[PDB]
Amino acid sequence: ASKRALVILAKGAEEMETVIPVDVMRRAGIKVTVAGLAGKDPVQCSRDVVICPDASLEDAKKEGPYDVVVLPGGNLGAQNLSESAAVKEILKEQENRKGLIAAICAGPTALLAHEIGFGSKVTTHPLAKDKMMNGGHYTYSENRVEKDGLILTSRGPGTSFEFALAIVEALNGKEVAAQVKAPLVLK
Amino acid sequence: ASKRALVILAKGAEEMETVIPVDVMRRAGIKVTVAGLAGKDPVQCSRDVVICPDASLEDAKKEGPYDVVVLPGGNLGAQNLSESAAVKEILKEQENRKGLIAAICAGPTALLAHEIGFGSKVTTHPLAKDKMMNGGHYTYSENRVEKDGLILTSRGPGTSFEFALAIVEALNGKEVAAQVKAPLVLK
Ligand SMILES: [Cl-]
Ligand SMILES: [Cl-]
Numbered sequence A, B: 001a002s003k004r005a006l007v008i009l010a011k012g013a014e015e016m017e018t019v020i021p022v023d024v025m026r027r028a029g030i031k032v033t034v035a036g037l038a039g040k041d042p043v044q045c046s047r048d049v050v051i052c053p054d055a056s057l058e059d060a061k062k063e064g065p066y067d068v069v070v071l072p073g074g075n076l077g078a079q080n081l082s083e084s085a086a087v088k089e090i091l092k093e094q095e096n097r098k099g100l101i102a103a104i105c106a107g108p109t110a111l112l113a114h115e116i117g118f119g120s121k122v123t124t125h126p127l128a129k130d131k132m133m134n135g136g137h138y139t140y141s142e143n144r145v146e147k148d149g150l151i152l153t154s155r156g157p158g159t160s161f162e163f164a165l166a167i168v169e170a171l172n173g174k175e176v177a178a179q180v181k182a183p184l185v186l187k
Helices: A015-027 A057-062 A075-082 A085-096 A109-113 A126-132 A157-172 A174-184 B015-027 B057-062 B075-082 B085-096 B109-113 B126-132 B157-172 B174-184
Strands: A004-009 A031-036 A050-052 A068-071 A100-104 A145-148 A151-154 B004-009 B031-036 B050-052 B068-071 B100-104 B145-148 B151-154
Touching: A004 A015, A004 A085, A015 A031, A015 A050, A015 A100, A015 A157, A015 A174, A015 B015, A031 A057, A057 A085, A068 A085, A068 A157, A075 A109, A085 A100, A085 A109, A100 A109, A100 A157, A109 A126, A145 A157, A151 A157, A157 A174, A157 B157, B004 B015, B004 B085, B015 B031, B015 B050, B015 B100, B015 B157, B015 B174, B031 B057, B057 B085, B068 B085, B068 B157, B075 B109, B085 B100, B085 B109, B100 B109, B100 B157, B109 B126, B145 B157, B151 B157, B157 B174
Parallel strands: A004 A031, A004 A068, A068 A100, A100 A151, B004 B031, B004 B068, B068 B100, B100 B151
Antiparallel strands: A050 B050, A145 A151, B145 B151
């Protein structure tokens, strides 16, 4: 049975942080659903790349639950995720079932907004640190990828491969991650 | 006057190799046109990410010429680029005007197909080397990014940031590339 990933795509998401994990997870044989926060219509990302989601979030939620829920960054994408009652419900359900939650760059600030994973060690983009740390509800890390309790976080576009391969290792194991990694020509 | 980039997007293109250069070039203030080989309609990439191009290639060609023409990889994307008379005409015009041509992963095999840049030092994805080298028309390199004459090449998804920043440096200079690079959290 293949593992399943939900990637929540909002207006202003960082397109690299969306596409790198989608693609790498699919390389790992993970069934990935790219779900549009706002509906089924195409999504204008932070640098104007337009991505057509596989489904609305409304519809994707009905086919849950998922082995991982993935929150890309992009400041305005993260803010949209943070404002969504639907996202809150998805993340709470995922936390309650002890499922993996993964977030990158400004993405982890939606965890704060939704009161998810408090007490965990987390990283973010450096410019998102102060936001994430408001109230001291997490312990901050400068690791390029951090993983504590249910919560897997990472820092930026340049850490997206490392983040995606961490998700792969958590779901499908270290051997699959290594096999996926080799053809990518990573440094 | 901002520099201008044409990124040619074909069915089966590697989505990471498409989105990383688009996004990084836009960060550098380059005006990027994502042009659909087949028309204006959305493009299904190699790992099923669907990207809506800015324009058809037909239309984008009319607004040329461009400071760089960019060929993503993906085997089936590259094959589609290699079969296109429109791409051939674009690359020949770009070569004739001594403009930059950039290609990544299997992308450089379209240069071979279209008889572009013979005699140049080039790199490709390792699995695309034998294709690229058929006839010995180029000199092969294992550098992660290679640049010789008009021709800038690179190896894979994992070299895409390095490739994009090389394009940025060629167009906008080393200082802009360094400024763009810092917030990406590259290794
Ligand atoms: Cl952003
Ligand atoms: Cl491919």
